[PDB]
Amino acid sequence: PEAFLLFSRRADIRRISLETNNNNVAIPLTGVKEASALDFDVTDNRIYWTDISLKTISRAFMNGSALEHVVEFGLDYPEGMAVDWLGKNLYWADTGTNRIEVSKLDGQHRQVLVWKDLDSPRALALDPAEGFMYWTEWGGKPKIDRAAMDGSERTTLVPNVGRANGLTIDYAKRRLYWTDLDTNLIESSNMLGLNREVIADDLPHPFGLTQYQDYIYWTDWSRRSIERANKTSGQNRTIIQGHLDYVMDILVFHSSRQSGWNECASSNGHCSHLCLAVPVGGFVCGCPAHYSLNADNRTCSAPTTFLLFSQKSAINRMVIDEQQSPDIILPIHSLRNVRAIDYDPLDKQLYWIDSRQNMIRKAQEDGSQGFTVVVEIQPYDLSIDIYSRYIYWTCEATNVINVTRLDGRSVGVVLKGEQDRPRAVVVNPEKGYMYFTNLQERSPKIERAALDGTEREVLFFSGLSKPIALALDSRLGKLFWADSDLRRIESSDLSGANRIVLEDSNILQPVGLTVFENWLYWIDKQQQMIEKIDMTGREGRTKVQARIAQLSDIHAVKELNLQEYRQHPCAQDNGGCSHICLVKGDGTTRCSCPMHLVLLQDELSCGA
């Protein structure tokens, strides 16, 4: 095959032939705003690039066909990116999120590999034939690190260096090349970071860098050129092309720079998801983020229990494990202003209220199969009855508690009052009751009523100013609320007895609650904190994550025991009720209706 040079500049990726007279021609791409890093897969005839402005990493054939954005979420400054041509994996480094991530070349099974004690990684280079991974860091103390291509065995390789760029591996001669942007030099070392040599010390402004055969190539922002020199002496210098201002990255598109082999190239290591190379030339099987590797070291299992917390324009997920895996943002599209979230553990789908679109939407954690349940209206809070498959939500515009099936079919209104202001809400269908804050003017209340609207009881009417969040734990028989004005979080029994203040200090704006098992999580929007307290009392109050802007809600998800779920008498086709299925104190069921219907003589159906 023929070798040619690709370079990025402005919103264009262009091609320069090294055999022919330099015929600068652009690759017919579309939708590119600011192309930066570049890589390729010669066996696929595909090119890969990152877009710093659009915060994406994309792929396309050399003819421009099959243009795909394989990474669209969770990016800030994707400066480093590299293609694992053996295991068919995509690596990238984000200077903003301070993360080294991996995924398939099509974007599936995205996983975080390095995230702890990582300050601004810039360039990234891969050596999958050996199983090593090299990157530069522009952190507090710039250096060049190394680790296995599964994220393990992280170490400092070159500590004594400035902010390096264009990290390139000479696979034939076992040397690392980089451009020190602080000292304006082109340097080289061996694979161990020793035997440092200065290749070119008289260049005005080198930036991009790549290596091919006996030559190194670089871009010079001062001479506005792409130049070439002997990779050893730095001599025999030549200009490949001039009048090219601010070229970001360069590479030689040729099969001689993607050689070698490993077990991932032959059988994907029989891994179900990710086949990650490790020294020396071996492999290990990897899983998507928050997935766990089974005992066979091949297959991956999805997380069964986790925490969800939402921001204004994002919905995130978090687990509790030993290695302390990082939180991820779920690829949910078109999030504008998320106010509250919920989760159906049966069909494993995510629900949320978007206050700007003023609707209740639904999708999986994949982001696929999006569907709007409710569409003026102003949904405020929501709570899912997972047994009767209904959503109990409050409408800030009409001041009612409205019930809707998961598929969008309306059940009806179960609560409405002249001066009622129902806001926060949580459903307890194991006992047949619901709890909601009633923010009446200068008289806020926390009330309880049956799931059909009857048996209204004010549980609390004093010591409140702006009760804004609610949580409930049915096994403990406990209700939890958080007052944003009084700046405290309280607890009480479901009956209303034993009201106690859990925390009332160092709390600015609590706007969400959830219970895991023995822990009570909450979010402080003003402090940008997610904290938790131990309810059994053994451990103390701890922070779990900080610097989270525009927090809106938090929701814990517990693995569903299906046989205990089927034992709930409303799980078997609503217990014969055409609308509201009510559990009564004896364990049996009763049927009821929304307020625009009446129960008929058959004690099962509701008619107008």
Epitope: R9, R10, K33, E34, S36, I52, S53, Y77, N165, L181, D182, F207, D245, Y246, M248
Partner: nanobody, 123 residues
């Protein structure tokens, strides 16, 4: 982040003038500050850019040798020293900032913050 230019006024041909760009809401240690100018009936033109951390400077050919961009060690302020002013230097000079260090500084679309601009007229 907010930016406020100042220093523009009427000035003679061959005279000098220094513009300044006051900045707020950051330490700007991760920012690039650039100067642009736009004359009536013309496209916006890149003038100069500087790394707040690093000191690397970049200039357009039309202002080389005549214009110098510099950084204040005290008051979060970037200066544009303009010597040997031609009549063609007449434009509204804008101050731009972006939280990224190495990129195409002439690419005005990718900057994140802009000021109100200040008018420089050269007779």
């Amino acid at each position: 982040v907010q930016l406020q230019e100042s220093g523009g006024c009427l000035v003679q041909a061959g005279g000098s003038l220094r513009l300044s760009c006051a900045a707020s809401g950051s330490t700007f240690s991760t920012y690039t500050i650039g100067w642009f100018r736009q004359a009536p009936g013309k496209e916006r033109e890149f003038v100069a850019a500087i790394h707040w951390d690093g000191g690397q400077t970049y200039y357009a050919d039309s202002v080389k040798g005549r214009f110098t961009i510099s950084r204040d060690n005290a008051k979060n302020t970037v200066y544009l020293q303009m010597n040997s002013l031609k009549p063609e230097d007449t434009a509204v000079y804008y101050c731009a900032a972006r939280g990224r260090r190495y990129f195409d500084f002439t690419y005005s679309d990718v900057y994140d913050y802009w000021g109100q601009g200040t008018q420089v007229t050269v007779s």
